[PDB]
């Protein structure tokens, strides 16, 4: 498939960052009064 590796590199970057950000949102929600 043409541009499979380009599309998949984009998909891998978007999905991993989505996992990192949702862990970040979850942890931030555990500490409502952090500074």
């Amino acid at each position: 498939l043409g541009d499979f590796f380009r599309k998949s590199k984009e998909k891998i970057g978007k999905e991993f960052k989505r996992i990192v950000q949702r862990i970040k949102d979850f942890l931030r929600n555990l500490v409502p009064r952090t500074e």
Partner: protein, 56 residues
């Protein structure tokens, strides 16, 4: 000349013989590279599958 045309027949027969064997080598290399690109594809999709397996 007759000798000139006989020599070019033998010359072309020899060149075409090696060109046919070169085409055979190049098509086998293309086939080898297509399989290597197919394996690289599975390695990419394997990372996608691992990232999907986080949500469930």
């Amino acid at each position: 000349s007759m000798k000139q045309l006989e020599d070019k027949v033998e010359e072309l027969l020899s060149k075409n013989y090696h060109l046919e064997n070169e085409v055979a080598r190049l098509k086998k290399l293309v086939s080898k590279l297509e399989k290597q690109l197919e394996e690289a594809q599975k390695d990419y999709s394997e990372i996608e599958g691992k990232l999907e397996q986080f949500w469930h």
